[PDB]
Amino acid sequence: SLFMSCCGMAVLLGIAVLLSSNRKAINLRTVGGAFAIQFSLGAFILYVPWGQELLRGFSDAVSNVINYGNDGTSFLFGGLVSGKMFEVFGGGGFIFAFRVLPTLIFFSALISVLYYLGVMQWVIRILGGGLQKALGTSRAESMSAAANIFVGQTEAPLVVRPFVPKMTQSELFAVMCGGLASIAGGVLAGYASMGVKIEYLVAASFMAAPGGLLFAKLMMPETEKPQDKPANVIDAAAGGASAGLQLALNVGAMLIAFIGLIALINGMLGGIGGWFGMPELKLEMLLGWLFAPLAFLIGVPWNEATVAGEFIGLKTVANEFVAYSQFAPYLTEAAPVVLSEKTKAIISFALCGFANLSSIAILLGGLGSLAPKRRGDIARMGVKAVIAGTLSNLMAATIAGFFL
Amino acid sequence: SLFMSCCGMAVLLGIAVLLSSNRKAINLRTVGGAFAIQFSLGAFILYVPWGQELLRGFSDAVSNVINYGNDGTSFLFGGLVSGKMFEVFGGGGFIFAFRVLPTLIFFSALISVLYYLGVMQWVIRILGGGLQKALGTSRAESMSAAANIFVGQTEAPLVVRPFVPKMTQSELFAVMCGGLASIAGGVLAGYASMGVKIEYLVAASFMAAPGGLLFAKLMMPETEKPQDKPANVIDAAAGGASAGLQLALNVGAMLIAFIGLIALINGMLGGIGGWFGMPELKLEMLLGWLFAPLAFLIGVPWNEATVAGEFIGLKTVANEFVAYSQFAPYLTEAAPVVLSEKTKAIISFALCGFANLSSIAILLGGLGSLAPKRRGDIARMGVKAVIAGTLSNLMAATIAGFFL
Amino acid sequence: SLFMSCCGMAVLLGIAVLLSSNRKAINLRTVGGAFAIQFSLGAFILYVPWGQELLRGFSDAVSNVINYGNDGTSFLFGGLVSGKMFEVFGGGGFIFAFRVLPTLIFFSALISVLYYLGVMQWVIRILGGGLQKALGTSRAESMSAAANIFVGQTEAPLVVRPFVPKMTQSELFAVMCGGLASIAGGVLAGYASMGVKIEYLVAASFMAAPGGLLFAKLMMPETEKPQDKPANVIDAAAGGASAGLQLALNVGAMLIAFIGLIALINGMLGGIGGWFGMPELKLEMLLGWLFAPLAFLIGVPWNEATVAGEFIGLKTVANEFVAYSQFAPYLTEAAPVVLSEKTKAIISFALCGFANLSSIAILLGGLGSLAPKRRGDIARMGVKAVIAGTLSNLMAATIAGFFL
C-alpha cells in the first residue's frame, strides 16, 4: 500500500546520507524542515481540497497565458498551426517545431517583462525569505532556490550575482542543486504544449525549491560560515524574445540530433543483440530493465515499472526534454501502453528536472561566468550535484504518488 | 480642406521649435531648405506627372527584384510557398515566416553586393552632396542621412565611420535622427510583401533624408564647429546573407513574442476594463483613443482617425514592424474596416520609420561601437531623437495626404 | 576512346607543373605516388569487383545512418516530411529546408561523438600514416589530408593544431589544399539526400586525400625542412548538434540569397543580352559556354559538355552546394536534359569539393585562428590553393570517367 512509498522516501534519504560529505555536520533543522516543507507542499496542493483548487487555478492561468502567446505563433506560421493540418496529415498535423518551440520564445519574453516590472523579484523575495527563516539556510542560496521555480539553472543565480564568488562550498553546491532539481518557465510551457499536465509541472517546480535544498544540505552540509537592466519594458521583452529564440534553436537542434542518434543506437543494438539471440534489443529496453527497480521503489506498480523506467532512465542519461518527447505519446488516446493515472503522475514528476550530466557543462559556463575563480569547484561537485538533483525529482515523484 | 494639412505641418514644426535646445541658434537656411526639399520631393513624385512616373518605374523595378529573390525562397520551402497553400488553407496558406522573412536575407545580400561594387556609395555621394550644398549641413551627417534611405540606422553611419567619434553633438543627433526617421531596404521589401504599397515605402524612404535633417536641426541646431571590405563579390553576398539571416531570426522572434504579449495584455485589459463596465477593452482601443487626435491633425478623416490611431500608436509604443503586421489586413479585400485610399497612404507613410524607444538601445550598440566614448551622448539624446524621428514620419504623412 | 581521358589527366598535371613555385623542387616520389594512389584507389573501388563491393557496402551503411538520423527530423517537422506532402504538393512536397538541412545537424553531432570515442582519430591515424610512408609527406599534413575525407576544411587541421603555427609554407599550402579538394561528412549526407549517388560522394571524398597532396606538392613543393574535449559523450553530441545548426542556418541563408541573386542576374542578362540579339541570355549559358571545353577535356561527351559546364562553372564561381542544387533535378526522372550515366558521374565527382574563392575567407578565419601569425601566408596562397583544389576535383572526375 502506502508503505512502499514511505520506504521509497526513506531509501532516497538514506542514499543522500550515505553520500554525504559529512553526516555529523548535517543540520537536522535544515534537512528536517526541508523535507517537511516539500512533503507538506505536496500534501497541500495534491490532497487538501483548498490547495488542490489553488493549484488548479494557477495552472489554468498558465494555460491561458500559453494560448495568448500562441497568437504570435499563429501569425508567423498561419495555416501550418491550424486545425486543417489535422485533416490533411492526421496525427502528423501537429508540427512540433511550430507548435512547441515558439512557446519558449514567448515565455522568455514574458519572464523578462515580469523581471523588469519587479513582479518576479517580489515573489522570489517572499518565497526565498520563508525558506531561510524555516531552514536556517543562507539568504543568497534561499533566493536562488526560489528563483529556480520560475527560471532556469543559469538564470536563477542572477538574483544573487554579487554574492556568488564568495559563497561557501555548501552554498555553491545548493545553488547548483536548485537548478538541477528544477526546470524553467519557458520549457514548462513547452512540456505542457506536448500534453504534460500543467498541474504536475507547476507542482514539481514549487516542490523543487525545498527539495533542492534538502538533498544539497544532506549531501553537502554547511561546514563554513556564510556572509551577509533594460532601458524600458519594451527592451525587456525584446531581450527575452532573443534569449528564447536561441534556446528554441538549441533545443530543436538537440532533439533532431539526439532522437536521430537514439535511432542509430537502436539499429546497432539490433545487430549486437542479435548475436545473443536478442535482435529486438533497443535502448528503451536497456533503460527500462535498468531503471525498473528505481521506478518500483518510488511507487510505480510492478506491471508498469519497466515502461516507467524507460523514460526515467532516458531523462537521466540524456535530458528531460528528450524523455518527455518519448513519454508524451503515452498521454494521448493513441498511447502504445495505457498507464495508470498514478504512474503517469509519477513519471511526470520524476522527469521534471534539469538533473543530467550535460547540465554540468551548462552550469560551468553560466554559473561559472558569475564567478570565474569557482569553476574548479563547480566541476568538482558536478556529479554529486546531479545526483542530489535526481534524488530531489525522485522524492517529489514519490510524494506525488503517495497522495494519489 | 487642405487647410487642415497645412495646420498639421505647422503644428509639427512648432512642436520641434518648442523642444529645441536653442531656438535662436536655428539656421533658417538649413531648416527652411530641408522642409522645402521634403515638401518638393513629395510634390514631385506624388503630384507632378513625370515624378509620379519615375516613382512608379522605380517601384516596379523593386517589385521585380523581390520576385527574383523569391526564387531562392521557393527553392528552400517548395510547396509551402506555392499556390496550393491557398487551396488547402485558404487565407492561412500565406505563411509569414516563409513568405516575408526570407526576403530580408536576399535583400541584405543584394545591398552588400551593391556596396562591394560601389553602386551604393555612388548614389549616396550624389544625394548626400546635394543635401549639404543646399542646407549647409556638414559632409558626414549629409551622407549618413542619404545612406539611411537604403540601409538601416546602424549601417548608414558606416559610410562616415572615422568621422563619428569627433562629431559635434548636433551632428551625432542628426545621424541618430536620420536612422530613426527611416527604415531599411531589407524590411521595405518585407513590408511590400505584406501588401504595403511599394510607392509609399520608396517615397517615405527618400523623404526621410531631408525630413530627418529638418527636425534634427530644429530640435538640435549646430552650436559647435564641425570638421572636414570583403575579398570578392561572392564573399560580399555571403556576408549580407548572414547578416540578413540574423535580422530575419530577430524579427521573427520579436513578432512571436510581441504579438503574443499584446494578446495577453488584451486578456488582462478585458478583466480590468470589466471593473469599469468595459469588458471589451483592448490595447488597440487605448492606442486608437489616444492617437486619434494626432491622426486627425495629419489629415486623417474624422471617421477614420481612431482606426488610424491604433496603428500609429502601436508603431510608436513598440515598432513599425508590429504596426504593419496589424495594418496589413486593412490593405486586402478582407479588411475589417474599409479605409479611404488617402487614409491608407497616410498610415503607410506615418508608420515608415524606425522611430521608437527600443531603437535607442539599438543605436547605443551599433552606432556606439563606432564611437565608444560617445555612448553617454547617445543615451542622453535618445528620447529627443526618437521624437524628432517621429515628427519626420508624421510630416511625411501629412505631405503625402496633402497631394492626395 | 580512353585516350581523351588520359590526355585530360596529362593536361591537368601539366597546368599544375606550369603553375609550380619551383618545378625543379618537385619530388617525383611524392607527386608520382600521390597520383598512383588516387588512380589506383579509383581503379579499385570503381572497376575492380571487390573494391566496388566494399564501396557499395560502405555507401549503404552511410545510407542507413541517414535514414536513422531522419527520425529526429520526422519528430520535429512531422507531416511536413511525410509521404502526404507528395500527394498534396506533388514534386513541391519535397521541402528542402526540412529534408536536407536537418541532416547537417544530425551528422555533425555524430561526427563529434565519433571523435569523443576515438573512432575518427583511429581511422585518420591509419590513413594519414599510410600516406606519409608512401609519399614522404610530413606527419602533420598527411593527417590533415586524411581527416579532410570525413570533416570540413576548418575542422580537419584540428587534429594537428599545435603543429600548424610552425608549418612550412608547403605544409600550410597542402593543409589548405586538403580542405579545398574535399567536402565534409555533414554536407555529403545533404547532397546524398538531394539525389546525388552516395558511392560517388564517398569515392570522391577518399580520393581527395591523395589528390589534394598531389596538386599541392606539384604547385608548391617542399623547399624547407618540416618538424616532428567535451566532458562526456552526451556533451560531445550536443556540441556537434549546435555546430551543425549554425552550419544549417548558414547554408540555408546562403542558398536563399545566391539562388535569388542568380535569378536577378538572369533577369538583367535578359535585357543586356537583348541588346545583342540574345534576350534568352542567362548565367547558365555563360558558364556552360565557358566551361564546356573543360568538361570535354575531363571526359564529357561532346553533346553533353555544355550542360556539364553549367554546373562545373557554377561550383567554381560560387560553391558546390549551389551547383548541386541545380544539378540535382538532372538526377531524377523529371530531368530537363537526360544525361549519360558517365556524364552524371563526372559532374558528381567534379563538383565534390569546397574549391572556390569564398572558401579562402573561410580558411582565413578557421585555419587562421589556429595560427594568427600565418594569416598573411594563407591569403597569399589562397588563389593558388583554390586552383590546386579545383585540379584535384577535376582529376578525380577524369579518373572516374575513365573506369566508367
Ligand SMILES: CCCCCCCCCCO[C@@H]1O[C@H](CO)[C@@H](O[C@H]2O[C@H](CO)[C@@H](O)[C@H](O)[C@H]2O)[C@H](O)[C@H]1O
Ligand atoms: C542517449 C543514450 C545513450 C546514453 C549513454 C550514457 C552516457 C553516460 C556516460 C558519462 O560519462 C562520464 O560523464 C562524466 C560527467 O561529465 C565525466 O566526468 C567528467 O566531468 C565530471 C564532472 O565535473 C568530473 O567530476 C569528472 O572528473 C570528469 O571526468 C566522465 O569523464 C565521463 O566518463
Ligand SMILES: CCCCCCCCCCO[C@@H]1O[C@H](CO)[C@@H](O[C@H]2O[C@H](CO)[C@@H](O)[C@H](O)[C@H]2O)[C@H](O)[C@H]1O
Ligand atoms: C506594446 C504594447 C504596450 C506599450 C507600453 C508602453 C511602454 C513605454 C514606456 C517607456 O519607458 C521609458 O522608456 C525610456 C526610454 O528607454 C526610459 O528612459 C531611459 O532611457 C532614456 C534614453 O536614453 C534615458 O533618457 C532615460 O534617462 C532612461 O531612463 C525610461 O526609463 C522608461 O521609463
Ligand SMILES: CCCCCCCCCCO[C@@H]1O[C@H](CO)[C@@H](O[C@H]2O[C@H](CO)[C@@H](O)[C@H](O)[C@H]2O)[C@H](O)[C@H]1O
Ligand atoms: C554567382 C554567379 C556570378 C559569378 C561572378 C564571378 C565573380 C568572381 C570574381 C572574383 O574576384 C576576385 O576574387 C579574389 C579572391 O578573393 C580577390 O583576391 C583577393 O583575395 C586573394 C586571395 O587571398 C588575394 O590573393 C588577392 O590579393 C585579393 O585581391 C580579388 O580581389 C577579386 O577581384
Ligand SMILES: O=c1[nH]c(=O)n([C@@H]2O[C@H](CO)[C@@H](O)[C@H]2O)cc1F
Ligand atoms: O532554461 C534552460 N536552461 C538549461 O540549461 N536548459 C538545459 O537544456 C536541457 C533540456 O531542456 C536541460 O536538461 C538543461 O540542461 C534548458 C532550459 F530550458
Ligand SMILES: O=c1[nH]c(=O)n([C@@H]2O[C@H](CO)[C@@H](O)[C@H]2O)cc1F
Ligand atoms: O535594419 C534594421 N535595423 C534595425 O535596427 N531594425 C530595428 O528593428 C525594428 C523593427 O523593424 C525597427 O524599429 C528597428 O528598431 C530593423 C531593421 F530592419
Ligand SMILES: O=c1[nH]c(=O)n([C@@H]2O[C@H](CO)[C@@H](O)[C@H]2O)cc1F
Ligand atoms: O563544413 C563545412 N565547411 C565549410 O567551409 N563549408 C563552406 O560552405 C560552402 C558550401 O558547402 C563550401 O564551399 C565551403 O566553403 C561547408 C561545410 F559544410
Ligand code: NA
Ligand atoms: Na530552475
Ligand code: NA
Ligand atoms: Na535608414
Ligand code: NA
Ligand atoms: Na574536408
